[PDB]
Design a binder for this molecule. Sequence first.
Ligand SMILES: [Cu+2]
Length: 129
Amino acid sequence: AQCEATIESNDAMQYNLKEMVVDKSCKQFTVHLKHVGKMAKVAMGHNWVLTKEADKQGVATDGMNAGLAQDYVKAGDTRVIAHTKVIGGGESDSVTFDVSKLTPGEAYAYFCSFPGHWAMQKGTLKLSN
Ligand SMILES: [Cu+2]
């Protein structure tokens, strides 16, 4: 709603939103990730990671390599515009980020970097009015 959105992840390694639009009057945007499945975070944990579409595989590989204690995102990875924590079934997490980190026109990729999820669990984020 307004300068925020909610996205659901389930036990099928899917996000319910394939596209998110950040309104141009927004200086901050907030994403609330909900894991509406029942599986454990070691089994089917999920997060939400935002990168320029170019850096998606790089971030997903380094992220898989950072472990669960780093929420599968390489610590201080400059390519990650924002990310939630890794959560398990029945949980939620939120992240707010600065919209000046994004450029109009330019398309961004958001995905889940939990092992093996990036390929499938993905969507596009764009800035518009
Ligand atoms: Cu996932």
